Amino acid sequence: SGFRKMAFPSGKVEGCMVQVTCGTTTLNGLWLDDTVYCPRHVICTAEDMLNPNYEDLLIRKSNHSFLVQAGNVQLRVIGHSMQNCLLRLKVDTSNPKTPKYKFVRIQPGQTFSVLACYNGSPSGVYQCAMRPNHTIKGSFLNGSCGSVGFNIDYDCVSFCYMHHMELPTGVHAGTDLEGKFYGPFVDRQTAQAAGTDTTITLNVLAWLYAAVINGDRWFLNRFTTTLNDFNLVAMKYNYEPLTQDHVDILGPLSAQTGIAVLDMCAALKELLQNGMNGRTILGSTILEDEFTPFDVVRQCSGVTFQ
Amino acid sequence: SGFRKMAFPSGKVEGCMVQVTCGTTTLNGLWLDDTVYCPRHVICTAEDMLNPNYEDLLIRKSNHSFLVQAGNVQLRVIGHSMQNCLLRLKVDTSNPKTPKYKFVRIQPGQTFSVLACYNGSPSGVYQCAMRPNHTIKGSFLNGSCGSVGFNIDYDCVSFCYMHHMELPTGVHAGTDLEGKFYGPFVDRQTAQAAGTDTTITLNVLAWLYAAVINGDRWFLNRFTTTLNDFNLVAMKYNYEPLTQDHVDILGPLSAQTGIAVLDMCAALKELLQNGMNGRTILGSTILEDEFTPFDVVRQCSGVTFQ
Ligand SMILES: O=C(Cn1nnc2ccccc21)N(Cc1ccsc1)c1ccc(-c2cccnc2)cc1
Ligand SMILES: O=C(Cn1nnc2ccccc21)N(Cc1ccsc1)c1ccc(-c2cccnc2)cc1
Numbered sequence A, B: 001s002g003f004r005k006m007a008f009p010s011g012k013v014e015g016c017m018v019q020v021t022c023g024t025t026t027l028n029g030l031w032l033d034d035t036v037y038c039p040r041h042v043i044c045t046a047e048d049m050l051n052p053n054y055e056d057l058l059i060r061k062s063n064h065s066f067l068v069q070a071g072n073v074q075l076r077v078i079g080h081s082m083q084n085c086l087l088r089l090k091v092d093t094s095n096p097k098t099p100k101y102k103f104v105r106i107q108p109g110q111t112f113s114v115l116a117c118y119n120g121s122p123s124g125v126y127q128c129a130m131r132p133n134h135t136i137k138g139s140f141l142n143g144s145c146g147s148v149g150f151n152i153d154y155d156c157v158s159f160c161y162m163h164h165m166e167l168p169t170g171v172h173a174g175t176d177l178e179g180k181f182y183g184p185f186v187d188r189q190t191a192q193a194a195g196t197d198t199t200i201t202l203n204v205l206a207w208l209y210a211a212v213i214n215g216d217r218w219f220l221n222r223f224t225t226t227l228n229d230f231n232l233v234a235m236k237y238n239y240e241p242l243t244q245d246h247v248d249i250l251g252p253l254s255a256q257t258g259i260a261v262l263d264m265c266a267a268l269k270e271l272l273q274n275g276m277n278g279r280t281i282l283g284s285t286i287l288e289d290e291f292t293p294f295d296v297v298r299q300c301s302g303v304t305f306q
Helices: A054-059 A201-213 A227-236 A244-249 A251-257 A261-274 A293-299 B054-059 B201-213 B227-236 B244-249 B251-257 B261-274 B293-299
Strands: A017-022 A025-032 A035-039 A066-070 A073-075 A077-083 A086-091 A100-103 A111-118 A121-129 A148-153 A156-166 A172-175 B017-022 B025-032 B035-039 B066-070 B073-075 B077-083 B086-091 B100-103 B111-118 B121-129 B148-153 B156-166 B172-175
Touching: A017 A035, A025 A066, A025 A156, A035 A156, A054 A077, A066 A077, A066 A086, A111 A156, A201 A244, A201 A251, A201 A261, A201 A293, A227 A261, A244 A251, A251 A261, A251 A293, B017 B035, B025 B066, B025 B156, B035 B156, B054 B077, B066 B077, B066 B086, B111 B156, B201 B244, B201 B251, B201 B261, B201 B293, B227 B261, B244 B251, B251 B261, B251 B293
Parallel strands: A100 A156, B100 B156
Antiparallel strands: A017 A025, A017 A066, A025 A035, A035 A086, A066 A073, A077 A086, A111 A121, A111 A148, A148 A156, A156 A172, B017 B025, B017 B066, B025 B035, B035 B086, B066 B073, B077 B086, B111 B121, B111 B148, B148 B156, B156 B172
16 A cells, blocks of 8 residues: 655666766766767857857767766767767767667656766656656756656666756756657757646546545545536646547556546546545645556556455 | 655665565565575464464574575575564575665654565665654555665665555554564554654755745745744644754754744744645645755755745
8 A cells, every 4th residue: 555656766777877078068878788878968068058059069079079987987989979959979888787778759748767867976766747848847956967767667768858958947858868859948048938737637537546446435426527528627727638548548447446437537527626625635635647547557556445 | 946755766775685485475685795684474374474473483494494586596595593573594695786785773754765676576666754653654565575765875775674564554664674663563463553643843844945945935934933832833733843953953954045943933833823825835735744854955956046
């Protein structure tokens, strides 16, 4: 029993973190096989960030413009190329700790583990959702760029995020491991801001199912709803519209608890209209939206506490 | 910016987890140098748990009653002894991944990282406080016994918890790495229950300081309080009494923000009396008590957002 914001064990990723220095700029990189990935803004001075032409800044560098430090060991760079907003440095040594891995572009509402790093040294691990506005509510200080996000399935690390920037509201933006930004953001100084965000409806429903698996039913009711009647309420409370795709994903949790998805939707509509009346769900006074249906099945018992 | 329940990077601990089997019972152990530590209830049958005499159950075992599996590798047990509520198995192989480590007995209110494990395989990592009632609000399923809690300081792992049991309210109890229980609990079936708990006052104050470091002052006020006038309110709201020791620990956060500790106490007294008026602090609608002053200084910027 219990229900926590749980991260994946970080060791497979810790063995990949290095420090990348270009001039007076240092940040983190990811060392897999004989390639180091890092934000391309490593090649900028403070002033360059105001209006960088990265093609023009990079052609001015050699392989020996870059220093890679893996623990105490210096790696020699033997190649470099830009891929979207990342640099790919070829190094003289294959990482002996390279795990089985993939690169994946996650979708909004999906969750991942972040390993916060500074100077190539991991400092902390925590679980993030990709917000519908393509930001994450991370915890990052200066030096954290190149920190990575990931998921683990059966000893394969799916890398999905590399940290590039903090926006003015204190939330965080970055790229996939092909260097494509999540959301409309760019790795230069502009007036860019987080767009309006929404509550991740599917995740709120998953977490209500989690609370029923763990033995709590107080918030259920004898009502049902149509998808459209639900969505009229959802729009009032700045929730994402529920789709039939979302109903189908909740099938297994529905089956484990014997609560029809639209009957759980009716329960959520009543929670949004009435509030929680000073009550808690899995210890929370608010509706949690940073657990996916997959997270709930990973963490909760396969046997409902009936 | 941002503020998250952050765990320590788990890799140094992942390289220590093994599976321990005695008969039909399997759970997790911790492999450091040539010793494996695990809960002594590994030697019990289901029926033995009702009223075990561990001295009498253990004298009936040999070294070869125990199987230790480290990944695919079988370790041979060459020695065994009981230490309080743990077994110490001597094995034929020193763990090559043993980190620099200590064993520490943490105090109530202090925080640690838990690596949830099943069958010697790490599944998740999350941060826990030791509650004043000597339980933790963990997330554990059957098979999780022998999972460990820890802190990391400069590459030294301080191991402080080994998981033994879930109590009837769904919270979790266990021992230090000398096998002494936190709290009054025992590793047998009884009517034992979590005692009454309290809010960790010191941690609530640390987290208010975190919110000011990160640039939020909405909840401050022009009042001060005496320690005793604060404690009269604290007792009404099931908060731990604040002591001068607690005031002294908050000195550095006080200095970084320029808010006197008792002026922060006045702010908390007003939050407890008035509530939060639909507002949030570091994204929370409740007063958080699972971050110590040390956690706040580890995670927050050294420069207050004035
Ligand atoms: O957001 C960042 C860096 N960053 N990331 N997470 C952070 C958390 C707290 C504080 C700063 C943090 N930016 C703006 C930016 C805008 C588009 S892409 C990056 C940032 C990148 C490089 C520099 C810099 C400084 C000196 C030399 N070279 C680069 C200067 C600024
Ligand atoms: O709490 C536990 C085990 N445990 N721990 N975390 C859990 C989370 C969810 C479910 C069960 C969990 N107990 C009770 C207990 C009371 C004092 S010490 C342990 C427990 C230990 C060994 C057994 C057992 C079963 C079969 C064979 N041998 C032992 C049977 C029960």
